Design a protein around this ligand. Structure first.
Ligand SMILES: Nc1nc2c(ncn2[C@@H]2O[C@H](COP(=O)(O)OP(N)(=O)O)[C@@H](O)[C@H]2O)c(=O)[nH]1
Ligand SMILES: Nc1nc2c(ncn2[C@@H]2O[C@H](COP(=O)(O)OP(N)(=O)O)[C@@H](O)[C@H]2O)c(=O)[nH]1
Ligand SMILES: [Ca+2]
Ligand SMILES: [Mg+2]
Ligand SMILES: [Mg+2]
Lengths: 342, 337
């Protein structure tokens, strides 16, 4: 997938965490928000690079999906041969086929939310284990709506908006504020709600989907150049698979190639600052910023243990081994701080 | 234009009001509502069949436009703005440009929105007495000059118009958005909860993602709308830039519906929207008739008892009352296309 760049950094972090006995730095959760059917689940899944999320026409995401990417060491290892999933609700059952994972999200949605468009705030908890992912939580959410349909109650719009607010009010989260290109940016429910929890725009990244669907005679040039609504962290256009493409089993590889071709053709001056890879790179930078901000905490925590193991040295092999391990940890911190992603 | 069918009906209704010496009822205002850029102004002007409304991307309609169609008696077409008083406009591109100018004068040149209406009269032999109201579309995030509470200002401006019980609401939703996300239908249901005066229009059918269509929406399988859900295809921004005519737009709309919605094509498109609206307007007309009827009876006995074995005027104005009752019956019996 497009978010492998941080793997060597988080491997070094894991070395430190193993010594310190605590996973002290937690990456922000990445939470996708926007109007129903704006292309949200497609964006989130593009960060995985594997097809595992129900996507489609009408209301689709009907429970929060807390999707925990879990990096797997070479020791705990087993391409479809190396990756697997576990759901909390299916206890210890292992999933190898990502199509079956997708179906189970749908299964578990139907069980709690019903089969006539109902929505539930109860999250589905999913872990995806892989040697090729970082430790990162992605959150898929129901999209904002206006008029109740199916089983939905009269106050469904507010139920959904309050549910979104609970996830993005988390200070340690990054909001992917999704708006479809075939709507006016000023009508963006994603940017409105993001500004309520993040008024200064320190953790909101604007994603513009469906660039391919814009009316003839129009384009998103002004939008993508920040000439409509400025958004500090970035405004990034993407092109994901159409419903036709989904129906035709179009691959992720072909989706990305066509997105590249599309941007080269219609937005040549802006192409290198747009697309799915650029969204990933932008996100990596935000995640690395969080890591760097937290290094002093980590360093201090090493010193706490270093002084403590040095003390009962003043269980003796235990102490000498740990001090060396903690000296190793201290060197690692400096290496991480000084890492810059290509 | 697409809405001439009521001309003969309002003409004979006028005769009845003339005869009874009463003021003719006003037809309800037709008010277009929806999210910014959903296709509202294109829908509203399609009921006129002349290009007089500014249309485009970004925020365009930034003042209400109260477009009063005025039927011209024998005893072509032109416009009059209240603010210019006397000047008459025969050039409809010049009318359009004046709407833009007036909008900039009061709302400024940086995306600001004003509740002050533009009053425009369009005089024609080929129109009925009818008021069409164009409104700024709903929004979420302030841009340019707009204050923090712009969304609420626009929404309450809309409510000011559609809260009028003598209004028909054209609830406009773009086909390239999920119907359940319709801000037009949400707001319409607030002022018209039983759907007695809300007509749903689905624009931009041609812009739907490949592998999708509005079949479920148009058959009432998503949100039911009592009075109807009617799909239309108006001119793209490319078509506007290229000055594509109304005639060509309608032809291509018809063709698109035949090709993509053959089973529903007869109950969709701009012509069907106009016919559906005429039928709604006819409903209002029939509801004024009992009032008119009782007034004819009062004047009838008032003229009849006035007798002496002047003495021929009361004789022929009794016959003009008899004529008026039969015209009322005719209106009730009239079928519309
Ligand atoms: N043409 C096009 N279609 C898209 C794009 N992104 C999503 N879609 C389509 O839009 C629909 C909604 O996609 P989804 O990811 O489920 O969005 P949601 N409902 O906001 O979770 C799907 O039919 C999908 O194929 C895009 O960039 N271009
Ligand atoms: N392709 C297509 N474009 C449309 C349609 N209706 C409106 N548009 C385009 O959408 C934009 C907004 O149209 P307009 O009538 O001004 O809508 P508004 N802003 O809601 O008053 C314009 O660029 C117009 O060309 C449609 O049915 N199909
Ligand atoms: Ca080392
Ligand atoms: Mg979704
Ligand atoms: Mg308009």
């Amino acid at each position: 997938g497009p978010m492998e760049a941080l793997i060597p950094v988080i491997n070094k972090l894991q070395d430190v965490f193993n010594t310190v006995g605590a996973d002290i730095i937690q990456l922000p959760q990445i939470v996708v928000v926007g109007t129903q059917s704006s292309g949200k689940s497609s964006v989130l899944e593009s960060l995985v690079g594997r097809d595992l999320l129900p996507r489609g026409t009408g209301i689709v995401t009907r429970r929060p999906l807390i999707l925990q990417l879990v990096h797997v060491s070479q020791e705990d290892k087993r391409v479809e041969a190396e990756e697997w999933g576990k759901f909390l609700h299916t206890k210890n059952k292992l999933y190898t086929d990502f199509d079956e994972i997708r179906q189970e999200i749908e299964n578990e949605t139907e069980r709690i939310s019903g089969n006539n468009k109902g929505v539930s705030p109860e999250p589905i908890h999913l872990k995806i284990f892989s040697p090729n992912v970082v430790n990162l939580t992605l959150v898929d959410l129901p999209g904002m709506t206006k008029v109740p349909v199916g089983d939905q109650p009269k106050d469904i719009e507010l139920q959904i908006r309050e549910l979104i607010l609970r996830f993005i009010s988390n200070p340690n989260s990054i909001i992917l504020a999704v708006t479809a290109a075939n709507t006016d940016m000023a009508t963006s429910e994603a940017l409105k709600i993001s500004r309520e929890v993040d008024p200064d725009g320190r953790r909101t990244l604007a994603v513009i989907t469906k660039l391919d669907l814009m009316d003839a005679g129009t384009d998103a040039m002004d939008v993508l150049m920040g000439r409509v609504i400025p958004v500090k962290l970035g405004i990034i256009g993407v092109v994901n698979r159409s419903q036709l493409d989904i129906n035709n089993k179009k691959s992720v590889t072909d989706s990305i190639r066509d997105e590249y071709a599309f941007l080269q053709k219609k937005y040549p001056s802006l192409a290198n600052r747009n697309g799915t890879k650029y969204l990933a790179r932008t996100l990596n930078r935000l995640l690395m910023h969080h890591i760097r901000d937290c290094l002093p905490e980590l360093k201090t925590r090493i010193n706490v243990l270093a002084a403590q193991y040095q003390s009962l040295l003043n269980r003796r092999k235990e102490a000498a081994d740990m001090l060396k391990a903690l000296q190793g940890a201290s060197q690692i911190i400096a290496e991480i701080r000084e890492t810059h992603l290509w």
